[PDB]
Amino acid sequence: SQQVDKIKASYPLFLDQDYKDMLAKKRDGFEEKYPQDKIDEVFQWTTTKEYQELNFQREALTVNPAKACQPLGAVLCALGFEKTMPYVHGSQGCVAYFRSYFNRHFREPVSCVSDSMTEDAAVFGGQQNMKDGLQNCKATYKPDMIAVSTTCMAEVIGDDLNAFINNSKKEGFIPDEFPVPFAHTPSFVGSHVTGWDNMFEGIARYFTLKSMDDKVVGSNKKINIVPGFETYLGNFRVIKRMLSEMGVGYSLLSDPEEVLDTPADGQFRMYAGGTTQEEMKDAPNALNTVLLQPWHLEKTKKFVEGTWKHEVPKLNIPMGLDWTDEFLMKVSEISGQPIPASLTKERGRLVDMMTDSHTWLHGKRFALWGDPDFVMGLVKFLLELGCEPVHILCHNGNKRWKKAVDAILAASPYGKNATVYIGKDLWHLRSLVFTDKPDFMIGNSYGKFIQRDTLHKGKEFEVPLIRIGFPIFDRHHLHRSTTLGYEGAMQILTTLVNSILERLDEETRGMQATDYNHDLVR
Amino acid sequence: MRQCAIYGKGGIGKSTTTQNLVAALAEMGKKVMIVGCDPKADSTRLILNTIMEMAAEAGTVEDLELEDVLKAGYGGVKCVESGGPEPGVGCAGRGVITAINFLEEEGAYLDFVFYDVGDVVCGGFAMPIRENKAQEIYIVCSGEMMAMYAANNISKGIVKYANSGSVRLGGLICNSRNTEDELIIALANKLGTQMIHFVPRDNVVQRAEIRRMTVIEYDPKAKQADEYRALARKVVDNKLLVIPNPITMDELEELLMEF
Amino acid sequence: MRQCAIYGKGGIGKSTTTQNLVAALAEMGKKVMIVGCDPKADSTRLILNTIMEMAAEAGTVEDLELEDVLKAGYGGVKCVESGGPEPGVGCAGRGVITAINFLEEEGAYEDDLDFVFYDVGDVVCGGFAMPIRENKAQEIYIVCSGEMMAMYAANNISKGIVKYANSGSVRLGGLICNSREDELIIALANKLGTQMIHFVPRDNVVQRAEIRRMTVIEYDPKAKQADEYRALARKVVDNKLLVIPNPITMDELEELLMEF
Amino acid sequence: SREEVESLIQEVLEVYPEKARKDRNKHLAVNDPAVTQSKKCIISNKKSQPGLMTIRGCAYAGSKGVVWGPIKDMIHISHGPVGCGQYSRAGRRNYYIGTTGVNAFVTMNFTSDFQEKDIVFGGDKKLAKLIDEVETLFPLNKGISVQSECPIGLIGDDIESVSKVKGAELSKTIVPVRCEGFRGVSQSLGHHIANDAVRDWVLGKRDEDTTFASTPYDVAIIGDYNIGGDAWSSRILLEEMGLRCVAQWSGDGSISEIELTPKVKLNLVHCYRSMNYISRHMEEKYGIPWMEYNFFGPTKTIESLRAIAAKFDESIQKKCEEVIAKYKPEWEAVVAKYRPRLEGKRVMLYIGGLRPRHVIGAYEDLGMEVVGTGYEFAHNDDYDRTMKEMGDSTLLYDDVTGYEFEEFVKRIKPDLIGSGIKEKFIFQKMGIPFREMHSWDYSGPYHGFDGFAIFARDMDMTLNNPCWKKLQAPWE
Ligand code: CFM
Ligand code: CLF
Ligand code: SF4
Ligand SMILES: [Ca+2]
């Protein structure tokens, strides 16, 4: 039943007696469900250290992954260029999913096409699909550039993207001078971040490889900035802000900040802003090139050092106090511009915030995960705050990365109860927060299920999720936050103390029970 | 009904002996069908619209009509070609996989079904020997180093699918180069099988080939024609089906050193 | 630094000739690298851990060192095998793509070689055409015979060349015939618009050496067949005829055959 | 509007190259409710033209995403690389009751996460090992499904042999589904492959079995995926009508329910497109008749209840009138409150293979008219059923491109649009109220009487929302 002025949606509709009874008849009558005592026994066992050894002994099964496939990162990279249509060569299912995935995170439209390769194109090769697809996309959606990536099906069968695009131009499907950079992005290699690296390098190649003879390093007096797989709009914004604040001439290579944030003013804009073609062509003339997420920009680094002849600085991601200081001073060194009074003051304000809140942050234990750079900068920051990053998981991380983060953990007393796990998933981490319970988890939306599981064991065993990373599907407008710089560090710091205080207020809200510690001032 | 798969190096005349073997089969009054699953040869040109090309003309494979892909030739032998890409592109394996599925679902299946398969470089070229498909496998070879190496390799594939399901090696078929006879018998014994038949090198075969005919069609009363009839009768009556035991490269080299 | 690809029907002696040729080449003092990309054969057994097997063992290709895969053999010829699945399973085509990519990325081609030889299997898919993409092999030599299915294979390969030729820099350097067959293959080349770079005669010494894991050059430098491979090598080193082939019809083929 | 939609169609198509121009032309049309046969008006279920931003999914999305995925007590394995599995992980709201990770596994993502070596060497040995791992780690699962992603289909991985040997060994039902994404042209063939996998590996398990106690009133809901609890809100009515609902196909479905379905007296088919295949099969093998029903909105629910009850006796028919009368005050209250707030408003829809014609009556119970409707992947038999349910000079579009939909909306100017997440933020930008008609914009149910209340509430909150009056700046 439904009362017209107090209409119930699924929750709490199904909690009404007639539905609850019907559901019980469905179960007892036709589901052949295991007895609750058995369901309860198996759950408790999935909580133990015994189950955890078994879980970690897996070599073929992956449950609840903390990563995605290459083409997704490729689409994001391509969206950072002016009026470009990300084009994925292969089957269409991939594209519907890529778009949906990014729609749900950014709450914005995401434009991307496929050339819909079907069973006969799998057998004959996707050459015809590439000819017509490039022609149709250019004629219909009118981009200035089409950036081609690939799905696994096209990678297995070895569709030569370079030959297919050249034959497309040769037969008159698209103009010979129409920009069509490409990158083979196999799903079965690396993850979404690798896709970004391959695509960026593919575009860099396209616009600079042939033209290197008239390039002089440092002649345009700018610093190139390569962001990497970035889903926080505030990160594009803070870097552009800090450099302009310093008077540093820069060029940000792959900037999707405008397309991923157009105004609802009455019109839909498929394309907005982005790195121009000329900014990519003029890129080798820069003083140097700073890669913001170096651990997944390795192929790009090799092309920049190899071909552009730039001495890319060994710099970590600018997250936290030290790495932001290092970034600014390196940028200062390279450009010749001094770090201004505004940034100096901003730094002291973050330190101020740290001295105000250290009491609640000290010794707080965290389980965390994400992409290698993000999770590494996060570990470092947590460590500067006096926190213990007990479980560090990076599904898509490699062995050298684990070494680097172990080195960082070794440098501080707060990283001594810490272990790094690469190639492990959220079902592995589910165990870790059960056997070696931390205070909070810092991760994406998939960790809401781990929180649900820990709460089923009991209120005391519940480990709360602090939503930082990608993807965030169950909260709104978090994609507008900043993770980079002092600005990002201040945001991260506030979220952590307030999550701690929120939780304390919750555990102390019991009348005459625990509320003796339900303090007005904290 | 008996489903059989024929593998073996192609540069010998594997498809030619497959079609000649069936021709004689038809001449005996046996109803046979040839399913071409080899991208390097034409498995039906001597007996006589591939599944892939016709599937594309109809939209997809689901719109395909078994009638647009089937066709009879000498002695009424039914013939279908799986189709595949033009050289250097696509995936011929998937073309075989798609072809075979279409035939299963469209119930294309008759005394014998003969699959003329290409090199087992992948999963798709083994589809003909999965559960409920070909039960007997014949490997045509010769006394050539790599021709024998090919048969031994194929045997390794037969082992994987034989342990899994029900398919066996029926024997070796020697396409003579006139160099040999004994060598292949020795290999078969090493493999634990038999040299079902030694096919002499008569030039009539080539005369027929150029005319687009098997020997049994071109000139029945010819000497070579009886050889194919004896091959046919031996395969019709063969009872020796086993799981091969492939040898090492060392064992093959050592065998060749004795001749 | 010339990169060459060798295609042809395997039942002939494709791998054996490629190796005897590279041996003659190394004998002239040329620095050569052989890249095995043929699942239906052993491409380096005569000159001497594949890339794919070594990769799996180490985790992934990214964990692979070039020294683990490259091994020097006769005449200092450097050998690399792509590797691939066992018979009837997996996808050998992708194995080739992966291996070549690894070689590119690991700077194997930039060591100062005179020649790189890809011994490729039958082009049944894009992966086995990896060797003829841009920045790879520029010269293609096809080993053939007077056999029908052997010449037809030579044509299919040519059609594949044509396709990648209109797209880039890859040409047909000619035909190599493994033993009036001498004339037949010459006409086949004229029809294709290329040449028969050399007619390798039939000689039991090749088998003698082959079964003993050697090329004739190593097995018996004084042999007459040895000089045949040295003749082929010189014709390859001095070859200047690179062309886009003009494939023929099976009808035109049955005409050529029927004329002999 | 009669010839204004034909000139619109031609004007929209003017932007495509010639090949795409001639193909899209036959995929767009204007309705004539006198056309029992849709093939001289619109063609469907043909491949998508390359590079035109189709909205379609793949066969895997159809198999794993919609048919097998909802089955709560089985472990469904996305076999291939990590992608498909992650993007489809809990994206569809196919509701269930169960303890996840213990006895239910719907919101979880089990993958074989293929790496290069699994592509090159093959992954059958990896699959076999994975199956042993889900057994020690998830002992309470009641079956396993193996959902093929593109690579499995090219590489020729013999997954049915693995399923056969591991299933016999572990005494488990393991279902291999050849639903690799490049097969077919959309999600649709994925439905078909899935239905076939159900009959070949699960449906006949309890064939010689006579243990189940049958009743003359036994029925099965076939094709209700329980989005937002849609199926539960549908079976409350069916069971209050005296019927016994032995099975729910996929929505909150269990494997035992599926096995028990051949034991029923009638198959009630909601989603015709995805499960007519298994229903037709159940008619020729078990003799079970099937009929189509619509539980969207009061006019349709009432009609459906009456038709369904007419297949049984006088006691069920009497209870049918009891239920119609019980809910009459309630749905009339909803109509009295929201219809005046919604009357005369125009809606354009573009959904999958059933909702574009199924939600029409519910919109019309609120006084709204659907001026345009279309499907991503329907066949002509769905379009046949669409002609009666739509108005006369209205727009019909099969596998609409991003371009076409945007421009059709610019001409027509509907007050509300109902489609998916990939077009939601496009039209909100354009100032047009949007409701997700796939995920119900995280609301639901929309089925039955209680669902109608939520549907009306939702159309009203979005259409008459105060934000739509503020898209333009007062200074321009
Ligand atoms: S888009 Fe239903 S034929 Fe299928 S997931 Fe949605 S209009 Fe599907 S009703 Fe259904 S629960 Fe659906 S909404 Fe048939 S199941 S492939 Mo996307
Ligand atoms: S049609 Fe391979 S991993 Fe999964 S998303 Fe793909 S690139 Fe990435 Fe359908 S079966 Fe899947 S979503 Fe085939 S691959 Fe797309
Ligand atoms: S090796 Fe086989 S499965 Fe792989 S792309 Fe080639 S034909 Fe297809
Ligand atoms: Ca938005």
PDB file of C-alpha atoms in Angstrom, chain D residues 167-328:
ATOM      1  CA  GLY D 167      30.979 -29.536 -12.749  1.00  0.00           C
ATOM      2  CA  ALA D 168      30.949 -33.347 -12.638  1.00  0.00           C
ATOM      3  CA  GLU D 169      33.940 -33.360 -10.272  1.00  0.00           C
ATOM      4  CA  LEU D 170      32.745 -30.735  -7.768  1.00  0.00           C
ATOM      5  CA  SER D 171      29.083 -31.868  -8.119  1.00  0.00           C
ATOM      6  CA  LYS D 172      28.266 -28.321  -9.166  1.00  0.00           C
ATOM      7  CA  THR D 173      26.207 -26.853 -11.995  1.00  0.00           C
ATOM      8  CA  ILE D 174      28.636 -24.782 -14.058  1.00  0.00           C
ATOM      9  CA  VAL D 175      27.128 -22.974 -17.038  1.00  0.00           C
ATOM     10  CA  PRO D 176      29.317 -21.840 -19.970  1.00  0.00           C
ATOM     11  CA  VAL D 177      27.935 -18.884 -21.862  1.00  0.00           C
ATOM     12  CA  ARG D 178      29.453 -17.960 -25.226  1.00  0.00           C
ATOM     13  CA  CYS D 179      28.365 -14.333 -24.886  1.00  0.00           C
ATOM     14  CA  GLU D 180      31.487 -12.612 -26.233  1.00  0.00           C
ATOM     15  CA  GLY D 181      30.732  -8.928 -26.980  1.00  0.00           C
ATOM     16  CA  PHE D 182      31.288  -8.900 -30.753  1.00  0.00           C
ATOM     17  CA  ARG D 183      28.540 -11.457 -31.433  1.00  0.00           C
ATOM     18  CA  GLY D 184      25.324 -10.070 -32.817  1.00  0.00           C
ATOM     19  CA  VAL D 185      24.725  -6.325 -32.994  1.00  0.00           C
ATOM     20  CA  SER D 186      23.600  -5.423 -29.447  1.00  0.00           C
ATOM     21  CA  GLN D 187      22.513  -6.740 -25.982  1.00  0.00           C
ATOM     22  CA  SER D 188      19.767  -8.658 -27.733  1.00  0.00           C
ATOM     23  CA  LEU D 189      21.744 -11.659 -29.003  1.00  0.00           C
ATOM     24  CA  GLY D 190      23.165 -11.803 -25.480  1.00  0.00           C
ATOM     25  CA  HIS D 191      19.618 -12.440 -24.168  1.00  0.00           C
ATOM     26  CA  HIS D 192      19.266 -15.308 -26.622  1.00  0.00           C
ATOM     27  CA  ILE D 193      22.604 -16.961 -25.808  1.00  0.00           C
ATOM     28  CA  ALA D 194      21.740 -16.663 -22.097  1.00  0.00           C
ATOM     29  CA  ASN D 195      18.267 -18.233 -22.550  1.00  0.00           C
ATOM     30  CA  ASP D 196      19.880 -21.130 -24.452  1.00  0.00           C
ATOM     31  CA  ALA D 197      22.483 -21.564 -21.697  1.00  0.00           C
ATOM     32  CA  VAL D 198      19.676 -21.726 -19.177  1.00  0.00           C
ATOM     33  CA  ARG D 199      17.833 -24.516 -21.035  1.00  0.00           C
ATOM     34  CA  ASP D 200      20.938 -26.502 -21.946  1.00  0.00           C
ATOM     35  CA  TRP D 201      22.534 -26.444 -18.473  1.00  0.00           C
ATOM     36  CA  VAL D 202      19.963 -25.593 -15.781  1.00  0.00           C
ATOM     37  CA  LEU D 203      16.287 -25.861 -16.742  1.00  0.00           C
ATOM     38  CA  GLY D 204      16.005 -29.600 -17.197  1.00  0.00           C
ATOM     39  CA  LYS D 205      17.821 -30.526 -13.997  1.00  0.00           C
ATOM     40  CA  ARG D 206      14.620 -31.486 -12.241  1.00  0.00           C
ATOM     41  CA  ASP D 207      13.066 -33.279 -15.197  1.00  0.00           C
ATOM     42  CA  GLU D 208      12.569 -36.804 -14.057  1.00  0.00           C
ATOM     43  CA  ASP D 209      12.046 -35.256 -10.439  1.00  0.00           C
ATOM     44  CA  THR D 210       8.436 -35.408  -8.932  1.00  0.00           C
ATOM     45  CA  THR D 211       9.194 -34.173  -5.469  1.00  0.00           C
ATOM     46  CA  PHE D 212       7.713 -30.704  -5.844  1.00  0.00           C
ATOM     47  CA  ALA D 213       4.142 -30.318  -4.668  1.00  0.00           C
ATOM     48  CA  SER D 214       2.187 -28.692  -7.470  1.00  0.00           C
ATOM     49  CA  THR D 215      -0.926 -26.549  -7.259  1.00  0.00           C
ATOM     50  CA  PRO D 216      -3.290 -25.558 -10.144  1.00  0.00           C
ATOM     51  CA  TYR D 217      -2.473 -21.920  -9.421  1.00  0.00           C
ATOM     52  CA  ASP D 218       1.335 -22.138  -9.860  1.00  0.00           C
ATOM     53  CA  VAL D 219       2.887 -19.397 -12.023  1.00  0.00           C
ATOM     54  CA  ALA D 220       6.274 -17.919 -12.906  1.00  0.00           C
ATOM     55  CA  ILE D 221       7.259 -14.307 -13.500  1.00  0.00           C
ATOM     56  CA  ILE D 222       9.466 -14.463 -16.570  1.00  0.00           C
ATOM     57  CA  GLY D 223      11.343 -11.352 -17.579  1.00  0.00           C
ATOM     58  CA  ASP D 224      11.068  -9.080 -14.546  1.00  0.00           C
ATOM     59  CA  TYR D 225      14.448  -8.065 -13.324  1.00  0.00           C
ATOM     60  CA  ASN D 226      13.296  -6.419 -10.113  1.00  0.00           C
ATOM     61  CA  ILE D 227      14.750  -2.948 -10.846  1.00  0.00           C
ATOM     62  CA  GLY D 228      14.167  -1.022  -7.612  1.00  0.00           C
ATOM     63  CA  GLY D 229      12.067  -3.927  -6.388  1.00  0.00           C
ATOM     64  CA  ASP D 230       9.778  -3.979  -9.479  1.00  0.00           C
ATOM     65  CA  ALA D 231       9.153  -7.754  -9.298  1.00  0.00           C
ATOM     66  CA  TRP D 232       8.303  -7.798  -5.578  1.00  0.00           C
ATOM     67  CA  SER D 233       5.848  -4.996  -6.193  1.00  0.00           C
ATOM     68  CA  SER D 234       4.353  -7.149  -8.955  1.00  0.00           C
ATOM     69  CA  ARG D 235       4.143 -10.497  -7.137  1.00  0.00           C
ATOM     70  CA  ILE D 236       2.385  -8.967  -4.145  1.00  0.00           C
ATOM     71  CA  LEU D 237      -0.616  -8.475  -6.468  1.00  0.00           C
ATOM     72  CA  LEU D 238      -0.329 -11.866  -8.113  1.00  0.00           C
ATOM     73  CA  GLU D 239      -0.159 -13.626  -4.738  1.00  0.00           C
ATOM     74  CA  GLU D 240      -3.007 -11.515  -3.261  1.00  0.00           C
ATOM     75  CA  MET D 241      -4.949 -12.755  -6.268  1.00  0.00           C
ATOM     76  CA  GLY D 242      -4.562 -16.319  -4.985  1.00  0.00           C
ATOM     77  CA  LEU D 243      -1.746 -17.386  -7.268  1.00  0.00           C
ATOM     78  CA  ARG D 244       1.430 -19.041  -6.151  1.00  0.00           C
ATOM     79  CA  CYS D 245       4.504 -17.521  -7.706  1.00  0.00           C
ATOM     80  CA  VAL D 246       7.010 -20.344  -7.851  1.00  0.00           C
ATOM     81  CA  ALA D 247       9.632 -18.384  -9.834  1.00  0.00           C
ATOM     82  CA  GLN D 248      11.025 -14.924 -10.645  1.00  0.00           C
ATOM     83  CA  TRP D 249      13.214 -14.854 -13.643  1.00  0.00           C
ATOM     84  CA  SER D 250      16.462 -13.374 -12.642  1.00  0.00           C
ATOM     85  CA  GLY D 251      15.146 -10.524 -10.512  1.00  0.00           C
ATOM     86  CA  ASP D 252      15.871 -11.875  -6.972  1.00  0.00           C
ATOM     87  CA  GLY D 253      15.882 -15.229  -8.717  1.00  0.00           C
ATOM     88  CA  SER D 254      17.592 -18.296  -7.340  1.00  0.00           C
ATOM     89  CA  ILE D 255      18.811 -21.326  -9.246  1.00  0.00           C
ATOM     90  CA  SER D 256      16.250 -23.610  -7.557  1.00  0.00           C
ATOM     91  CA  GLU D 257      13.420 -21.302  -8.742  1.00  0.00           C
ATOM     92  CA  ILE D 258      14.644 -21.718 -12.313  1.00  0.00           C
ATOM     93  CA  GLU D 259      14.822 -25.504 -11.880  1.00  0.00           C
ATOM     94  CA  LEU D 260      11.299 -25.465 -10.456  1.00  0.00           C
ATOM     95  CA  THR D 261       9.810 -23.405 -13.275  1.00  0.00           C
ATOM     96  CA  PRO D 262       8.920 -26.352 -15.570  1.00  0.00           C
ATOM     97  CA  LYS D 263       6.605 -27.439 -12.746  1.00  0.00           C
ATOM     98  CA  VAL D 264       4.238 -24.472 -13.112  1.00  0.00           C
ATOM     99  CA  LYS D 265       0.916 -23.950 -14.888  1.00  0.00           C
ATOM    100  CA  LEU D 266       1.618 -20.641 -16.542  1.00  0.00           C
ATOM    101  CA  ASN D 267       4.528 -18.438 -17.565  1.00  0.00           C
ATOM    102  CA  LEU D 268       3.695 -14.757 -17.114  1.00  0.00           C
ATOM    103  CA  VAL D 269       6.050 -12.883 -19.429  1.00  0.00           C
ATOM    104  CA  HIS D 270       6.759  -9.245 -18.659  1.00  0.00           C
ATOM    105  CA  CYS D 271       9.883  -8.596 -20.741  1.00  0.00           C
ATOM    106  CA  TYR D 272       9.000 -10.149 -24.079  1.00  0.00           C
ATOM    107  CA  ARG D 273      12.344  -9.320 -25.725  1.00  0.00           C
ATOM    108  CA  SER D 274      14.775 -10.998 -23.328  1.00  0.00           C
ATOM    109  CA  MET D 275      12.846 -14.095 -22.340  1.00  0.00           C
ATOM    110  CA  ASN D 276      10.325 -15.068 -25.013  1.00  0.00           C
ATOM    111  CA  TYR D 277      12.931 -17.617 -26.138  1.00  0.00           C
ATOM    112  CA  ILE D 278      12.928 -19.653 -22.932  1.00  0.00           C
ATOM    113  CA  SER D 279       9.123 -19.290 -22.665  1.00  0.00           C
ATOM    114  CA  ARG D 280       8.544 -20.630 -26.149  1.00  0.00           C
ATOM    115  CA  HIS D 281      10.874 -23.497 -25.281  1.00  0.00           C
ATOM    116  CA  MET D 282       8.905 -24.264 -22.125  1.00  0.00           C
ATOM    117  CA  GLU D 283       5.766 -24.504 -24.188  1.00  0.00           C
ATOM    118  CA  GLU D 284       7.087 -27.095 -26.654  1.00  0.00           C
ATOM    119  CA  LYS D 285       8.951 -29.230 -24.051  1.00  0.00           C
ATOM    120  CA  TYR D 286       6.851 -29.023 -20.877  1.00  0.00           C
ATOM    121  CA  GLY D 287       3.570 -27.857 -22.367  1.00  0.00           C
ATOM    122  CA  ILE D 288       3.449 -24.687 -20.216  1.00  0.00           C
ATOM    123  CA  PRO D 289       1.482 -21.847 -21.911  1.00  0.00           C
ATOM    124  CA  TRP D 290       2.700 -18.247 -21.719  1.00  0.00           C
ATOM    125  CA  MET D 291       1.145 -14.814 -21.930  1.00  0.00           C
ATOM    126  CA  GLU D 292       2.355 -11.238 -21.962  1.00  0.00           C
ATOM    127  CA  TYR D 293       1.425  -8.772 -19.266  1.00  0.00           C
ATOM    128  CA  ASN D 294       2.046  -5.093 -18.381  1.00  0.00           C
ATOM    129  CA  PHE D 295       2.185  -3.896 -14.775  1.00  0.00           C
ATOM    130  CA  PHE D 296       3.017  -0.248 -15.565  1.00  0.00           C
ATOM    131  CA  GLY D 297       0.256   2.013 -14.283  1.00  0.00           C
ATOM    132  CA  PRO D 298      -3.333   1.261 -13.170  1.00  0.00           C
ATOM    133  CA  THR D 299      -5.063   0.822 -16.561  1.00  0.00           C
ATOM    134  CA  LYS D 300      -2.520  -1.802 -17.572  1.00  0.00           C
ATOM    135  CA  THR D 301      -2.202  -3.500 -14.173  1.00  0.00           C
ATOM    136  CA  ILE D 302      -5.977  -3.894 -13.946  1.00  0.00           C
ATOM    137  CA  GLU D 303      -6.153  -5.232 -17.536  1.00  0.00           C
ATOM    138  CA  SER D 304      -3.288  -7.646 -16.835  1.00  0.00           C
ATOM    139  CA  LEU D 305      -4.713  -8.935 -13.591  1.00  0.00           C
ATOM    140  CA  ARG D 306      -8.021  -9.633 -15.355  1.00  0.00           C
ATOM    141  CA  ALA D 307      -6.416 -11.475 -18.278  1.00  0.00           C
ATOM    142  CA  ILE D 308      -4.156 -13.525 -15.990  1.00  0.00           C
ATOM    143  CA  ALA D 309      -7.019 -14.429 -13.646  1.00  0.00           C
ATOM    144  CA  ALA D 310      -9.194 -15.416 -16.642  1.00  0.00           C
ATOM    145  CA  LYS D 311      -6.783 -18.298 -17.318  1.00  0.00           C
ATOM    146  CA  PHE D 312      -7.734 -19.830 -13.978  1.00  0.00           C
ATOM    147  CA  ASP D 313     -11.008 -20.501 -12.087  1.00  0.00           C
ATOM    148  CA  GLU D 314     -13.803 -18.406 -10.546  1.00  0.00           C
ATOM    149  CA  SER D 315     -12.111 -18.145  -7.135  1.00  0.00           C
ATOM    150  CA  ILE D 316      -9.016 -16.461  -8.595  1.00  0.00           C
ATOM    151  CA  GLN D 317     -11.214 -14.177 -10.734  1.00  0.00           C
ATOM    152  CA  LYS D 318     -13.177 -13.172  -7.617  1.00  0.00           C
ATOM    153  CA  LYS D 319      -9.925 -12.400  -5.756  1.00  0.00           C
ATOM    154  CA  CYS D 320      -8.854 -10.435  -8.828  1.00  0.00           C
ATOM    155  CA  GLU D 321     -11.826  -8.113  -8.377  1.00  0.00           C
ATOM    156  CA  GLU D 322     -11.017  -7.949  -4.663  1.00  0.00           C
ATOM    157  CA  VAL D 323      -7.507  -6.681  -5.384  1.00  0.00           C
ATOM    158  CA  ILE D 324      -8.635  -4.178  -8.053  1.00  0.00           C
ATOM    159  CA  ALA D 325     -11.114  -2.752  -5.535  1.00  0.00           C
ATOM    160  CA  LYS D 326      -8.554  -2.737  -2.716  1.00  0.00           C
ATOM    161  CA  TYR D 327      -6.102  -0.542  -4.632  1.00  0.00           C
ATOM    162  CA  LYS D 328      -8.693   1.554  -6.417  1.00  0.00           C
TER     163      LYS D 328
END
